[PDB]
């Protein structure tokens, strides 16, 4: 019938890009699905928010037999 | 407090707590005030005479603030454990 | 808009209680669960009661 509705933007996306130094608990990326997967020292929240489980620099890699993007923390 | 019609800050927040009528008759005394008293022995009356606490004060507590140098006899006053040590360290005496 | 709010009262003497919802049309049986009672600091059984 009639349009005119929308929802508030959710501010998704990457918060800390490759090489950035983060503290433990820092949110790395907010996402709906697991577009990015948790690697080493990275947790996956209930809404699939990837957060650093240790200090260090974030690192993006593509691994596995399905070429999936992983995010890990190079502990430094 | 008017914010253009939006529910102002002091109305969208809840009220909390209550006012104690005993807090209005309670005062705190610094160690540096023990020398201002006259006679050495300190109590409610001597503190009021020295214009240190209000005339309506019924309870008084000595806290570790400032410093005491002379032997003082505290009587009928609550004393913190930190001030109790400092008063006894200056040869003072505390009696309930 | 069918689920009614209920409360689960602890079997212990303490008046502590949880609150939850329940569809009383499909599930007429009383709800009983083992939940942590923070007053006695033990896991006791909680029985249903009216809110």
């Amino acid at each position: 019938t009639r349009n005119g509705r929308d929802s508030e933007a959710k501010r998704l996306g990457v918060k800390r890009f490759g090489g950035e130094s983060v503290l433990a608990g820092s949110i790395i990326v907010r996402q709906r699905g697991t577009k990015f997967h948790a690697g080493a020292n990275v947790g996956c929240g209930r809404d699939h928010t990837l957060f650093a489980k240790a200090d260090g620099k974030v690192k993006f890699e593509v691994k596995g037999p399905k070429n999936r993007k992983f995010i890990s923390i190079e502990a430094e | 407090g008017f914010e253009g019609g939006q529910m102002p800050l002091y109305r969208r927040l809840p009220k909390f707590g209550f006012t104690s009528r005993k807090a209005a008759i309670t005062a705190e005394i610094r160690l540096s005030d023990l020398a201002k008293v006259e006679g050495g022995v300190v109590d409610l009356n001597t503190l009021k005479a020295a214009n240190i606490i209000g005339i309506q004060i019924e309870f008084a507590k000595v806290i570790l603030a400032g410093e005491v140098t002379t032997p003082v006899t505290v009587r009928g006053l609550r004393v913190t454990k930190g001030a109790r040590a400092a008063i006894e360290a200056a040869g003072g005496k505390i009696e309930e | 808009g069918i689920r009614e709010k209920i409360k689960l009262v602890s079997s212990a003497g303490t008046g502590h209680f949880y609150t939850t919802t329940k569809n009383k049309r499909t599930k007429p049986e009383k709800l009983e669960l083992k939940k942590f009672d923070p007053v006695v600091r033990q896991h006791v059984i909680y029985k249903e009661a009216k809110i």
Binding site: - | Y10, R12, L13, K15, F16 | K5
Partner: protein, 64 residues
């Protein structure tokens, strides 16, 4: 004449040591069944008034 305190503000804000104001959180009066316990737990302690709102509070509590 003396400035009159907004009495409604005096019942909701307490002045802290460094001049800030503490206040109770909203959203903890009713409708808690549907609220997650984690959410309700984080609303129990008192909070400080944000920097953007101090101007409104100070104007309402001149003797605080």
């Amino acid at each position: 004449p003396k400035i009159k305190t907004v009495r409604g503000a005096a019942k909701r804000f307490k002045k802290t040591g460094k001049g800030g104001f503490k206040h109770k959180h909203a959203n903890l009066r009713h409708i808690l069944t549907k609220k997650a316990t984690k959410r309700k737990r984080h609303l129990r302690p008192k909070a400080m008034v944000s920097k953007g709102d101090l101007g409104l509070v100070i104007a309402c509590l001149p003797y605080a």
